[PDB]
Amino acid sequence: GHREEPYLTEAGRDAFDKFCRLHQGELQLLAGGVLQAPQPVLVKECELVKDVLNVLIGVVSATFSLPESISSLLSEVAEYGT
Amino acid sequence: LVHRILPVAASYSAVTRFIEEKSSFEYGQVNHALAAAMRTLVKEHLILVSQLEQLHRQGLLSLQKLWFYIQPAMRTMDILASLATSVDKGECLGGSTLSLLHDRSFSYTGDSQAQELCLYLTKAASAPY
């Protein structure tokens, strides 16, 4: 056996997140320092759920002060707690 | 999160001092009875925390779970602390500490949870007068 070198559209959860930071770096190069969009990591899933459910109680957190599309998904429920 | 939970701790220390101070002879006949009726409400506040501690022995308790459990005690000790400070700040002895409790019974009339606590304290404080 010598398998079919993971076709892209099926191989994710590491290779897609690697891949997100690749297209992010590409856009940053096409801008050239004038974009500089970091933090393509961090953290986990369940603790983020307890975090956002805590935001509904008014609570402050590590990312709530007072890929990369989770900021938009997070704003939709952040403005609920405000 | 513990900053949100600590108001019931602050509303406990200002109740035990009121009962410890107004159990002295100089405070008449009725302010004795007002500090008398609050201690059956101190008993339940302790019983919840001992039951939560014995539950915490089994590891089946969380900080969010505890904050869910103590929600009635946060209200009941707050009404007792409000009555405690209202009797202390304006000096209320005898009939004057019988008027203020009748006022708070009219303040809470539609909740029926804080009314019943306050109406219990009125009938208990009205016994000597």
Q: How far apart are the CA of A80 and the nearest CA of chain B, in angstroms? A: 19
Residue with tokens 């900021």: A71
Cα–Cα dist B38/B18, whole Å:
10
In this structure, what DSSP letter does residue A60 have?
-
Residue in A80, A75, A74, A36 with CA at minimum distance from that of residue A58: A80
Cα–Cα dist B38/B20, whole Å:
11
Residue in A27, A48, A49 with CA at minimum distance from that of residue A36: A27
Cα–Cα dist B48/B44, whole Å:
6
CB B98 within 8 A of CB B77: no
Tell me the H-state helices in chain A.
15-31, 46-55, 70-81
Q: Which 3 state secondary structure label does DSSP give A58?
A: coil
Cα–Cα dist B87/A76, whole Å:
47
A54: which 2 tokens?
Answer: 């805590």
Question: Nearest residue of B to residue A60 by CA position?
Answer: B1
Q: Which 3 state secondary structure label does DSSP give B58?
A: coil
Residues of A in contact with B4 (CB under 8 A): 57, 59
A64: which 2 tokens?
Answer: 């709530």
Q: How was this structure determined?
A: cryo-EM
B46-78: burial string, b at 16+ Cβ within 10 Å, e else: eeeeeeeeeeeeeeeeeeeebeeebeebebbbb
Residue in B88, B87, B82, B56 with CA at minimum distance from that of residue B69: B56
Find the chain B residues whose C-beta atoms sit closer than 8 A to any C-beta of A. Answer: 1, 4, 64
Residue in B34, B24, B7 with CA at minimum distance from that of residue B94: B34
Residue in B57, B74, B56 with CA at minimum distance from that of residue B65: B56
Residue with tokens 């002879």: B25
To test the contact with chain B by mutation, choose from A49, A57, A64 the residue with the greatest count of B C-beta atoms within 10 A, namely A57
Question: Nearest residue of A to residue B1 by CA position?
Answer: A59
Within chain B, strands assigned E span none
For residue B5, what are the contacts with CB-CB under 8 A and spacing of at least 6? B66, B67, B70
Cα–Cα dist B77/B10, whole Å:
9
A50 and B64 within 8 Å at the Cβ level: the answer is yes
